[PDB]
Each structure stands twice: as structure tokens, then as C-alpha cells.
Amino acid sequence: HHWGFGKHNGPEHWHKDFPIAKGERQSPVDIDTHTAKYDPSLKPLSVSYDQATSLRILNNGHAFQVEFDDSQDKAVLKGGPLDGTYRLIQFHFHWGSLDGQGSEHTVDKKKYAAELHLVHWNTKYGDFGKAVQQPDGLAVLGIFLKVGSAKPGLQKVVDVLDSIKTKGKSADFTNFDPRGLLPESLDYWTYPGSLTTPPLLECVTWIVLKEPISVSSEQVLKFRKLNFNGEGEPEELMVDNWRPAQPLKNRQIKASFK
Ligand SMILES: [Zn+2]
């Protein structure tokens, strides 16, 4: 009876196994655009993905994750609110059963159809496992998805999902360029928060882009054909794998733009 997104093990239950669920810097949060302060010290976000090396895509039982070779400085995030260099390790999404919900962060209470997380770890901690034990261990770049025109750069991801339908399935996924998932503007909000799946560690500097990317209805529909369950088990569609907004508590969200 482990954590999940069902009726008996979903986000409202997680605190029982992971008490930090009720912590002081939990994510996601609602971004109140009128309360976020423009910060004239925030540098432009530097995203250097030209040498990114994807390896594999995995159905991990709550989402799918595209993993990268992070053994060299190849795909790095720096600048913005960050000190130092953070290396890309994986990206994954959160999505809904319907276009009207699916994002984890919300903007003035608005829910998007999905949310992309590009997860990076602080190179000063040597690897991901050590980084998540530190308050500044991770930087996660969050990008909202809305349903409209197709995102061509996403299609290679959508087309491989049939091969990883059920929990535990993985597939070779090389030469995928995550630059094809970025919106035009890198304007962002930033605040200190946490992983949004257990163990919910409070190790993340969140950088959430203001500009959503558009994906097609057909693209998001294919996300919804994935399964939470393993092969040979009763079918449960992988939908609504998003944690709802958590109390902001003692935190200020800063904006890179006015
Ligand atoms: Zn996530």
C-alpha cells in the first residue's frame, strides 16, 4: 500500500509516510501574479542544452521520465536565481484526465492541462543522491502546457509511449533534444520549495516559466493512454498525477519581469 494518485493513497495521504508533506517549504504552490515581487537582482536564466545526451525513457508507475547522461557538464542550468551550475538529469510531466486540470503550479488559481519539469542537480554536491539532501540541491525548471497547436519537438516523446505503457517498462531514448520543449520567453517566477512526489524533500529552487508551450489535444491524449499499473495487472489509466497547491507559508515568490 504505497503512495500514489488513487482514492486511498493520493496526495492527502502522503504525510503519513512522509511527514515533511506538511513542511515549511512544500511544492507546488499557487503563483499570485499580483503579489510576486519583481526582483531587479534576478539575472537572465541560462539554459545550455546543446550537448544534452538523453539515454532512456521509463514508466516509473506515477509518470514517465526521460533520463539524461549527467556524468559530464553537458546540459546545464545556471544564472537566474541560482548560484553555481546545475546539471540536467531527467524530465517528466504531470497531467490531468481533462484539459481543465493537470498542472501542479497554478497561476492566479488557473490550472493548465499539464506541466513539464526539467530536473537539475547542483554540481557542487557531486551527484543527485547527495544533492537532494541539501536546501539548494536541485533546480527544477517548470513549464506549463496548454492545449492548442501541436508541439513538434514533443512528438518523439509521444510516439514512444506505446512501448512503455505499464509500470516498469523502459525503452532506449537517445538523441532527444529538450530545447524543442522550451517556449520563446524565459521570463520566470522563482521560489524555494520541494520535490512534488515523495520523498517531498525540501531541496528545490523552483523556476517556473511564465510562457506556456502549446501541445495538441492528440499529444496529451496519448499521455492519458499510459497505465499506473504493471503489465498483467488491472488497468488504471495514468491520469491526474499532479499534487495540488500547498500553503505558501513564509515564502515570497519573485518575478524576473515587470
Ligand atoms: Zn514533477
Curated annotation (Swiss-Prot):
UniProt modified residues of type Phosphoserine: 163, 170
Stated consequence of mutating residue 60 to V: Reduced activity
Effect of residue 60 to H: Reduced proton transfer
Binding of substrate, residues: 196-197
Documented effect of changing residue 60 to L: Reduced activity
Catalysed reaction equations from the record: hydrogencarbonate + H(+) = CO2 + H2O; urea = cyanamide + H2O
One term under GO cellular component: extracellular exosome
Keywords: Acetylation, Cell membrane, Cytoplasm, Disease variant, Lyase, Membrane, Metal-binding, Osteopetrosis, Phosphoprotein, Zinc
Record's cofactor remark: Zinc. Can also use cobalt(II) with lower efficiency, but not copper(II), nickel(II) and manganese(II).
Phenotype for residue 3 to A: Impaired activity, not rescued by 4-methylimidazole (4-MI)
Listed result of changing residue 195 to A: Reduced CO(2) hydrase activity
pH dependence per the UniProt record: Optimum pH is 6-8.
Effect of residue 63 to S: 2-fold decrease in enzyme efficiency, as determined by kcat/KM ratio, and efficiently inhibited by chlorzolamide
Cofactor field: Zn(2+); Co(2+)
Site (Involved in the binding of some activators, including histamine and L-histidine): 90
Role description: Catalyzes the reversible hydration of carbon dioxide. Can also hydrate cyanamide to urea. Stimulates the chloride-bicarbonate exchange activity of SLC26A6. Essential for bone resorption and osteoclast differentiation. Involved in the regulation of fluid secretion into the anterior chamber of the eye. Contributes to intracellular pH regulation in the duodenal upper villous epithelium during proton-coupled peptide absorption.
Quaternary structure (record): Interacts with SLC4A4. Interaction with SLC4A7 regulates SLC4A7 transporter activity. Interacts with SLC26A6 isoform 4 (via C-terminus cytoplasmic domain).
Protein name, per record: Carbonic anhydrase 2
Organism (species): Homo sapiens (Human)
Gene symbol of the encoding locus: CA2
